[PDB]
Amino acid sequence: GVGISTGTFNNQTEFKFLENGWVYITANSSRLVHLNMPESENYRRVVVNNLDKTAVNGNMALDDTHAEIVTPWSLVDANAWGVWFNPGDWQLIVNTMSELHLVSFEQEIFNVVLKTVSESATQPPTKVYNNDLTASLMVALDSNNTMPFTPAAMRSETLGFYPWKPTIPTPWRYYFQWDRTLIPSHTGTSGTPTNIYHGTDPDDVQFYTIENSVPVHLLRTGDEFATGTFFFDCKPCRLTHTWQTNRALGLPPFLNSLPQSEGGTNFGYIGVQQDKRRGVTQMGNTNYITEATIMRPAEVGYSAPYYSFEASTQGPFKTPIAAGRGGAQTDENQAADGDPRYAFGRQHGQKTTTTGETPERFTYIAHQDTGRYPEGDWIQNINFNLPVTDDNVLLPTDPIGGKTGINYTNIFNTYGPLTALNNVPPVYPNGQIWDKEFDTDLKPRLHVNAPFVCQNNCPGQLFVKVAPNLTNQYDPDASANMSRIVTYSDFWWKGKLVFKAKLRASHTWNPIQQMSINVDNQFNYVPSNIGGMKIVYEKSQLAPRKLY
Amino acid sequence: IGGKTGINYTNIFNTYGPLTALNNVPPVYPNGQIWDKEFDTDLKPRLHVNAPFVCQNNCPGQLFVKVAPNLTNQYDPDASANMSRIVTYSDFWWKGKLVF
Amino acid sequence: VGYSAPYYSFEASTQGPFKTPIAAGRGGAQTDENQAADGDPRYAFGRQHG
Amino acid sequence: PAAMRSETLGFYPWKPTIPTPWRYYFQWDRTLIPSHTGTSGTPTNIYHGTDPDDVQFYTIENSVPVHLLRTGDEFATGTFFFDCKPCRLTHTWQTNRALG
Amino acid sequence: LDKTAVNGNMALDDTHAEIVTPWSLVDANAWGVWFNPGDWQLIVNTMSEL
Amino acid sequence: GVGISTGTFNNQTEFKFLENGWVYITANSSRLVHLNMPESENYRRVVVNNLDKTAVNGNMALDDTHAEIVTPWSLVDANAWGVWFNPGDWQLIVNTMSELHLVSFEQEIFNVVLKTVSESATQPPTKVYNNDLTASLMVALDSNNTMPFTPAAMRSETLGFYPWKPTIPTPWRYYFQWDRTLIPSHTGTSGTPTNIYHGTDPDDVQFYTIENSVPVHLLRTGDEFATGTFFFDCKPCRLTHTWQTNRALGLPPFLNSLPQSEGGTNFGYIGVQQDKRRGVTQMGNTNYITEATIMRPAEVGYSAPYYSFEASTQGPFKTPIAAGRGGAQTDENQAADGDPRYAFGRQHGQKTTTTGETPERFTYIAHQDTGRYPEGDWIQNINFNLPVTDDNVLLPTDPIGGKTGINYTNIFNTYGPLTALNNVPPVYPNGQIWDKEFDTDLKPRLHVNAPFVCQNNCPGQLFVKVAPNLTNQYDPDASANMSRIVTYSDFWWKGKLVFKAKLRASHTWNPIQQMSINVDNQFNYVPSNIGGMKIVYEKSQLAPRKLY
Amino acid sequence: LPPFLNSLPQSEGGTNFGYIGVQQDKRRGVTQMGNTNYITEATIMRPAE
């Protein structure tokens, strides 16, 4: 009713330990959510076409052209790690657990409050806020997944990461099919390469509305809404990283001479002439057995074209790759392709007391070693006569198509039946948690945005909207926009996300890497003297595991 | 390709795709490996090039042997120099049963 | 049936270069043993093993 | 697996054999820029050391029960059962040109 | 380094780190350990799958 | 029998997780143990008196005078952390557990081998080693605790810390009562201060022999010996440290003015004149309420005289103190009193490939903040008229007894009914694990050498000795030493030490300190290229806990 | 545990003492004096007082 609360605030994280070294992790998250009435009550079909940017030759990667349906609804999205875990919980999980299973997800809305704004227009302007006891909040749960899946973490538009900071939902919109052609060019390209927005293909038209597809609940101040528990069916997520490349698989060569003194100058030696060695190689016309040429069971990782842009009906898009560059761990400047870069605002980790629209950014450098170092690649002739002469070798410094800045590694692909790789690591706090699986006949082996992929279904998207609060002068047959009482809503959101994790064991004599507070990062985890908070990113696959 | 007379496009060519069909490696008698452990990566290779049989969950533990230290009367653990041992070697019989 | 792959391609990772493995051996090696080359495993062994 | 180094038990029942000294890879970082004959200068060829987060020092004694066998003792592993895919003893000949 | 310091010899790289243990490995994972040529002939001539 | 093994080698550590967040930790430790026959078969009563050292005025702290019974027996002592845990297990325990309970202890001896040494005396001298199939190893377990308790960790003489390194027992000996007087002096003291060894008090004489007090088992090569399981009754050991001193207990003062901008220059202010404040103080004649003067519930820590040497019947000994110096954490040079210093050899953490008799050393700086900073102490007159004048204050720089290097803090004691303190933290790897409780009517509240103290009893000491291997010419009535065949024994020792630990919970937003491998300490946990190993010390109370 | 004596007397009498036989600041063991290397009977850590 008017004066009775309809729910409870809970933002605790409970670790319930089982037998056999498993733990149930139930993350409770609660937020005060602020929602204004939509700018307009109508669905819009809006085309964006930044021709000015792409009209500059060589700027085709800056294409923003697209068509989207703008809806009056707002999306409540909790699909991001920072929503559910503070840094202490994350430290516990990543330091003490070896794998993580996504179990269930629940959410509810309670203590709904709706208010109207009255502006007096007095010479000193002033306004007052009145409770609208009979106004309603419209809530729709797309449990059948009829609406397009639009996870907000990819735009950094989920619920905020601070329990004591009120947050907002994000205005909902989804892609509307369009055709677009963009011929690539470079600086010094003569003329205007074709840069055209062709319109919409009628056979691909899909205009979705919430009202026609989803039951809509009207919540007054005394009402509440609960989704019920959803249970996931995803694969487990490892909290360890592999380090073994092809060079560290299997039995090392026997060393016939071992160092007799310590130091960095005292190496061992195999002690057998390279073409007089025993073992197996896939090179049937050579006698050289070396660490480079010896047969390995399969290939860890794969090379892919990097900063390749493929074009389809909707225009160019970057070719995604499964794993980040090799050597980025030793030199952060070499992260580049496959190392996800996250940009986010003050709701999601940026120091809350900073000013300006510039976001906080970081590039995630995963601990796993499944990537490539293209400067170390080469192709050489089948004859394999060593030392290889210039004409019999293709080096990463050899131009392709006459371009000094492009080599064969830029267009190289070694993905095959022997390729082995890992799933993407969780990115705390900004990374997405779960993602819907594509509805294609043949599905990708993984996603690059979330560790957990929903095979059959995962929870319906939650949509909210302030119900129209008409004045006395409404006229439906009038073309002009509806005249509404300025109305906004504050409601409380509570979610429960349950995981199942396995406690790690100590397999080696040595200790392993562990997340730790220290003198340098100390003040990333406590408020400033004026209450400024931040959440810096954390790694998740600290402990190694043996690949083979 | 790239101005190199000894390199052509086939050296860098890849036609692996969703339509690719292929076979497992044949057994190599007598020197070929029989079984191999599967990688502990999330995504696994479709085959191995070294053994026809690939162990999915596990395959037999490796067997390790070592002659136990046979100390002389003058052992000193706190000495940095190498342990003084009686020259000892072992001969044992190994029997395996492999069923196909 | 089958696939073409880069042959005597050497990819580099953290531990240094390694040869790109391929699933099947060269065609025409059956008629001419000199054309075995990539994908045809070569075994080297001592007096214990043949 | 020792077959990749040709270091398994011997293939002759009447010939005494030996085991192979055990060793395993320890993580290291290494950069080797490729070159050819006639490449000017010294391409970077560096051993960078070991990444601490990849360090794995295994010992038998800390991970495996160790049986001490005197001359009157014996040791049996017990039967291990595989779960591998079948291996064909036939070859296909049809390329794309001989289908259908 | 002496081998790979020669330009064009990068395929001869043997660089690596290994733990040398006092233990010895008894490995029977090879066909020759289990079959003489007569048994192998029987298997490969009379069987279609293994 | 001769050709049959009587036990199995096990050096694994198993973590068995229970419900309610408890884990059973069973540490298995196995060692090959080398034992020579004793130098002599007789008990000796030996007096050590380093008069030359103490005859130098001001060297009285170097006194080594004592009497001891030297026995032919050897003590097998496994009471040290390094015996049971490698660094990886220790990292797991200290990073993931909040408290540790000592549960049970078992040990056994098996695969006994006895050999004789025959020296040929050939012009090139040579010797051969024969099995003595009928020789025996004498094993005695003092399960009733009749013998004096002599834990070897205090001399760094326990079993070695490496499963693959053969170890030795330590020759057993125990203190024999003596009377000794040593008058302290300094450089420039005139004459010879009395420095006398008075002999032995007859009413304090205690001559213990193994043979008269303990059953002795004779083990031939086919025999084995097991102690049976002993169960401890000790108090739990915390794996967290407290940080709150008296200054951080209870409600802080309310700040009437808070900073409006970030930075190290923007402090808050209480905003109330100090003698106009509200609250409670124990200073009944002052109106000043400050953080220094406000009443706190009790006292955390206590001041004690430091490098005080008290004298009793047996001569001077240093006064022990419960906790180490404050400020040693920020400056390792200020560790000094209460910070235990461990010195050990190549069996117990020193780099095994080093040479020379100089031991490896470290001073343990505990994370707990229960210590004192005597340079910050002061005493002032009861009148408490501020600012205090020189005559009304005793400062740490004021000489005591005319000595410029001695101030009142050197003789100060603030232990009282309000004192609170913690138990000593475990010291990995060299620290002792458990210690026997004194048999006095009034017992100490803790020990400074071991976290676990045995109240009623803890396991009997294990004694071993090669049985006499006589030649054919033995003559008991001859005064000369017994003529024995040169005989030594190698046997395998296996112990099982079981703990019970509680998994830690994350109580705070921020992460906590955690033990971790990094680029600097990386090569402390792996062997060198010539097989050199070391075990560096680790801390054990990394995570904080709230005291109040 | 008393210190181990590396040299024991070879004849009886009140003049024939044993000797520890290790230089005092080169000894092994535990002390509560964190800024000294001297391990002696006076300075060696004892369980309590």
User: Following DSSP, what letter does each residue of A465-532 receive, concatenated?
Assistant: EEPP-B-TT--TT-SSPP-B--EEEEEEEEEEEEEEEEE----SSS--------TTTGGGSS--TT--
How many beta-carbon pairs below 8 A join chains A and D?
A: 102
Check C8 against A379: CB less than 8 A apart: yes
Residue F192's nearest CA partner among F200, F181, F202 is F181
**CB-based contact A303:A372 (threshold 8 Å):** yes
Q: Tell me the C-alpha distance between G28 and F543, whole Å.
A: 31
Report CB contact under 8 Å: A292, E10.
yes
Asked if residue A491 lies in contact with residue A33, where contact means CB atoms within 8 angstroms, the answer is yes
Which chain A residue's Cα is nearest to C46? A278
Q: How far are the Cα atoms of A148, A149, A195, F242 from residue A45, in angstroms, in the given order?
A: 15, 18, 21, 62
How far apart, in Å, are the Cα atoms of B100 and each of D3, D83, E43, E50? 19, 12, 11, 7
A429: preceding bond cis by omega (within 30 degrees): yes
Rounded CA gap, G9 and F70, in Å?
11
- Residue F167 CB partners (closer than 8 Å, separation 6+): B77, F31, F32, F33, F34, F159, F160, F347
State the Cα–Cα distance between residues F336 and F363, nearest whole angstrom. 9
**CA atoms of F267 and F256, how far apart (whole Å):** 12
Looking only at Cα atoms, what is the longest distance across chain F?
98
Q: Is A22 helix (H, G, I), strand (E, B) or coil?
A: strand
Contact yes or no for A260/A266 (Cβ under 8 A): yes
- Largest Cα–Cα separation, chain D: 67
Chain D residues touching F3 at Cβ < 8 A: 70-73
Please tell me the distance in Å from A417's CA to the nearest CA on chain B. 5
Sequence-distant (6+) residues with CB within 8 A of A274 are: A288, A289, A290, E3, E12, E14
Q: CA-CA distance, D29 to E17, in Å (whole number)?
A: 9
**Closest chain C CA to residue E33:** C49
CA dihedral sign of residues B28, B32, B38, B43: negative
- For residue F333 the two structure tokens come to 């040079």
Beta strands in A341-425 (DSSP E): 341-344, 360-363, 378-380, 393-394, 419-420
* Residue A125 C-alpha from the chain's centroid: 45
Rounded to whole angstroms, how far apart are CA atoms F328 and F367?
Answer: 10
- Find out whether the peptide bond into B69 is cis, omega within 30 degrees of 0: no
Using the CB atoms, write b or e for F94-111: b if 16+ within 10 Å: bbbbbbbbbbebbbbbbb
> β-strands F127-131, F543-545: how paired?
unpaired
Please list, in sequence order, all residues whose beta carbon lies within 8 angstroms of the beta carbon of residue F148, skipping any fewer than 6 positions away: F174, F175, F208
CB F432 within 8 A of CB F154: yes
Closest CA to A86 of A504, A503, A532, A525: A525
Provide, as residue numbers in chain B, all residues whose Cβ is less than 8 Å from the Cβ of A419: 43, 45
Q: Strands F240-242 and F66-76, how do they pair?
A: unpaired
State the amino acid at position F187 in one-letter form.
T
State the amino acid at position F19 in one-letter form: E
CA distances from F231 to A268, B32, B85, F408, F498 (A): 49, 55, 38, 46, 9
Hey, CA dihedral for A416, A421, A423, A425, is it positive or negative?
negative
Chain A 272-291, residues with CB within 8 Å of chain E CB atoms: 274, 288, 290-291
Sequence-separated (6 or more) residues with CB below 8 Å from residue E14: A253, A270, A274, A290, A291, A292, E3
Tell me the angle at which helices F87-96 and A87-96 cross, rounded to the nearest 10 degrees.
150
- The DSSP secondary-structure symbol of D44 reads -
Question: Residue A146 carries which side chain, given as an amino acid letter?
Answer: T
Cβ separation E35–B31 shorter than 8 A: no
Count CB atoms within 10 A of the CB of residue A101: 18
**CA F152/CA C30 separation, integer angstroms:** 73
Looking at residue F285, what DSSP letter applies? T
Cis peptide before F163 (omega within 30 of 0): no
- The CA-based angle F509-F514-F515, given to 5 degrees, is 175
DSSP B67: P
Reduced to 3 states, what is the DSSP secondary structure of residue F106?
strand
Instruction: Answer yes or no: are the C-beta atoms of C42 and A283 closer than 8 Å.
Output: yes
Across the interface, of D62, D65, D71, the residue whose CB is closest to F163 is D62
Closest CA relative to residue A39, chosen from A88, A74, A2: A74
Cis-peptide, bond into residue B30, ω within 30° of zero: yes
Alpha carbon distance A217, B53 (integer Å): 58
CB neighbour class for F310 (10 Å; exposed up to 12, middle 13-18, buried from 19): exposed
Residue B97, classed as helix, strand or coil, is coil
Q: What angle do CA B41, B44, B49 make, to 5 degrees?
A: 120
Q: Which residue of C has its CA nearest to A325?
A: C13
DSSP letters for G1-49: -PPP-SB--SS-STT--BB--S-GGG--EEEEETT-----TTTB--S--
Residue pair F172/F75 in contact by the 8 Å Cβ criterion: yes
Among chain G residues, CA nearest to F440: G49
For residues B33 and B49, give the distance between their C-alpha atoms in angstroms, rounded to a whole number. Answer: 10
Q: How was this structure determined?
A: cryo-EM
CA distance E18 to chain B (A): 17
**Of A424, A426, A468, nearest to A446 (Cα)?**
A424
All residues at 6 or more sequence positions from A154 whose CB lies less than 8 Å from its CB, including other chains? A432, A449
User: In this complex, which of B11, B47, B49 lies closest to C7 when CB atoms are compared?
Assistant: B11
Please compute, for residue F144, the number of CA atoms within 13 A of its CA located in the half-sphere on the CB side: 7
Chain D residue with the nearest C-alpha to that of B53: D84
Cβ–Cβ of F9/D55 closer than 8 Å?
Answer: no
Which amino acid does the sequence have at A315?
A: G
Those of residues 1-50 in E touching chain A at CB distance below 8 A are 3, 6-16, 18, 20
| DSSP-assigned letters across all residues of F291-318 | TTTB--SSEES----SS-EEEETTEEEE
Give the integer Cα–Cα distance in Å for D22 and D59.
Answer: 11
In DSSP terms, which residues pair with F34 in a beta bridge?
Answer: F490
Query: Beta G29-33 vs F337-344: how paired, if at all?
Result: antiparallel
SS3 state at C34: helix
CB atoms within 10 A of CB A133: 11
Phi-psi region of D27 (alpha: psi -120 to 50; beta: other; left: phi over 0): beta
Tokens of F519: 């680029």
Q: Are the CB atoms for F77 and F463 separated by under 8 Å?
A: no
Taking the C-alpha atoms of residue F536 and residue B73, their distance in angstroms, rounded to an integer, is 30
C-beta atoms of C50 and B32 within 8 A? no
Under an 8 A CB cutoff, do E15 and A389 touch?
Answer: no
Contact between C6 and B14 (Cβ < 8 Å): yes
Asked if F170 is an interface residue toward chain G (Cβ–Cβ < 8 A), one would say yes
CA angle A360, A363, A368 (to 5 degrees): 150
